[PDB]
Design an enzyme around this catalytic site. Sequence first.
Site, mmCIF file in Angstrom:
data_model
loop_
_atom_site.group_PDB
_atom_site.id
_atom_site.type_symbol
_atom_site.label_atom_id
_atom_site.label_comp_id
_atom_site.label_asym_id
_atom_site.label_seq_id
_atom_site.Cartn_x
_atom_site.Cartn_y
_atom_site.Cartn_z
ATOM 1 N N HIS B 41 4.235 8.297 62.240
ATOM 2 C CA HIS B 41 4.283 7.323 63.328
ATOM 3 C C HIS B 41 2.897 6.807 63.769
ATOM 4 O O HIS B 41 2.830 5.894 64.596
ATOM 5 C CB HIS B 41 5.119 7.800 64.524
ATOM 6 C CG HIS B 41 4.533 8.909 65.333
ATOM 7 N ND1 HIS B 41 3.564 8.668 66.290
ATOM 8 C CD2 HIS B 41 4.888 10.211 65.388
ATOM 9 C CE1 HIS B 41 3.329 9.836 66.866
ATOM 10 N NE2 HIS B 41 4.101 10.795 66.355
ATOM 11 N N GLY B 143 -1.465 12.206 72.973
ATOM 12 C CA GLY B 143 -2.592 12.409 72.061
ATOM 13 C C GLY B 143 -2.550 13.724 71.291
ATOM 14 O O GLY B 143 -3.365 13.947 70.384
ATOM 15 N N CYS B 145 -0.096 14.651 69.266
ATOM 16 C CA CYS B 145 0.641 14.523 68.003
ATOM 17 C C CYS B 145 -0.234 14.866 66.809
ATOM 18 O O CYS B 145 -1.397 14.493 66.791
ATOM 19 C CB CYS B 145 1.246 13.134 67.865
ATOM 20 S SG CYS B 145 2.484 12.748 69.122
#
Lengths: 305, 305
Positions: B41, B143, B145
């Site tokens: 993503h 942030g 991820c």
Amino acid sequence: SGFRKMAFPSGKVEGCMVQVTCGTTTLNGLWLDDVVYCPRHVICTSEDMLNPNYEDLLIRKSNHNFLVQAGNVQLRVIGHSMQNCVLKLKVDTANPKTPKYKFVRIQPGQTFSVLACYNGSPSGVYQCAMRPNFTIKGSFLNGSCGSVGFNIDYDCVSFCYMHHMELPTGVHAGTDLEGNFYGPFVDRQTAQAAGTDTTITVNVLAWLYAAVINGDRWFLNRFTTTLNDFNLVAMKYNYEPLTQDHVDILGPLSAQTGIAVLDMCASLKELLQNGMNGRTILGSALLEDEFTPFDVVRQCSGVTF
Amino acid sequence: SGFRKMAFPSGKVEGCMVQVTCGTTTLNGLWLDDVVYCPRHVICTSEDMLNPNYEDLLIRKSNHNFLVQAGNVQLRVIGHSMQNCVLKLKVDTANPKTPKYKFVRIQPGQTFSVLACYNGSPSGVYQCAMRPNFTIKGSFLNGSCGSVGFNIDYDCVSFCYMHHMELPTGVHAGTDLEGNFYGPFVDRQTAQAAGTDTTITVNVLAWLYAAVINGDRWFLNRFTTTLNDFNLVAMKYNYEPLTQDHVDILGPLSAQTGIAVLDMCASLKELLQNGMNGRTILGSALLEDEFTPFDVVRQCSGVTF
Ligand SMILES: O=C(CN1C[C@@H](C(=O)Nc2cncc3ccccc23)c2cc(Cl)ccc2C1=O)NC1CC1
Ligand SMILES: O=C(CN1C[C@@H](C(=O)Nc2cncc3ccccc23)c2cc(Cl)ccc2C1=O)NC1CC1
Ligand SMILES: [Cl-]
């Protein structure tokens, strides 16, 4: 979202852990620059521990009696000296992995990360607090002596604890990195006991602010209290007194959530007098006191190292 | 003595964390050998997150659209491919800090350490478990991820989780390092919800054995139970069923303490019925389920108190 007992990343400290052997005794050492720091009781036998004369035991040792192993490499000891309850072994090689560091002495209520080690090899990292009775509730087995506690400030490691012993209640005692014990403890096999412990009030309040930030607000109420009335209540429940310094330190969390510190004190007073009534706060049925106001701000803002 | 929620030392993983940027999106990547792994993503805008067509978004990218930063050094991307929900970025430099590693897919009940990161920089380490509903109760902000979960049994790092998203209840969802999600989740902003969660029964039993090893028996009783009667009662408290596999796995702890697994099951039944009556078990007023039988054996002494 979420709130966990979080330790600092341990990498900068793992690169400093070594194995120190003196005769039959093996424990952990901290290698910074050209010095290895370890508990002075490494020179004791089980009989010596009953009543040791450390200077007398040390004078009988030469540099070659100390075996220092860093990974699979044997370090050469070129000097030795004692500072309080810490042995300093001068080695011929400076640690190329030495991070930026300081030695700091912490106060009760302050938290730190512990890198538990066995045979100079790190096995785990956990977070804990210096209890008001100067003990730490650690998780340590035989061979863990010399394991260290630390905090990180930007890129600087502040070493604050070195493990020395376990008391009969299963709690732990140790020193700062200058060898001064935290608490009324001595390094010898003799009858010693942890004093009656208390709850770290400013930390419980910080953790209640963290729960509010995470959506747990059932314990909030319309009430407030004076600082004096709260301390009369808190003294009744074995809670540490809350000072004006603690109220000032909680200011940022108070502004972020809209709950005045004495407003949160009235919530804590009600929780002490009446309990949780079957409810939990951040997944706990006890009031948690091992997160400082700074830990709460750091975890709720994502500070990196 | 002592029993703490203990994470593995994070050093081997800190040396693999990098920052990955694609346009306006920045997240974390795991750099092992000459490949950087990150959530796919990273190629999405906020306007793409409802129904992204990843293959269509990816075909429009070239290697130079991906900016990879390792500390203060810019890495050169020389290839890119998608495997399930992870993006693999081939780089021109192998990571000199690559530890010995494996990619392992874990099952519900399994525990692991999480190194939470922001902008390729580690901020903290905590221990957690894959819940029976395939979510994890982490502590993650925007942030985070690309942050990873791992175990370090012996000298090899087994990567088992990569963080992808937070669900509306504040819990987290992610994938194994081959990009397969744990649970019925998709990397889309569509309405998704964690199923009803349950307590990891085999882990609570292991933790009760840890309490016995550390010297506590107040919760034991003179009774035993059949496996079927235990499951009929456990399921009324939202506890996972205990299988014969779980009973076999608890065998070593049963032999060490002298308490048969079905006798410990009888003690758990009584605990669920009575609560703790003001008492604690290993410093907790709730029954803990984020320690596996393997974690208890690794942390506890081999000698029961
Ligand atoms: O019986 C002893 C002997 N033991 C040795 C050692 C010490 O306490 N080491 C240890 C540390 N941390 C955790 C441990 C877990 C299990 C066993 C030893 C541990 C010590 C060090 C010092 Cl500075 C003073 C006294 C002693 C001292 O009595 N062990 C203590 C537990 C009871
Ligand atoms: O508002 C959003 C946007 N948000 C972005 C991102 C995502 O969930 N990121 C995050 C991860 N971990 C912790 C977070 C904590 C606060 C904010 C974002 C977090 C995502 C990724 C994926 Cl694969 C699918 C959906 C989303 C998605 O909805 N969701 C958040 C409020 C829960
Ligand atoms: Cl597994």
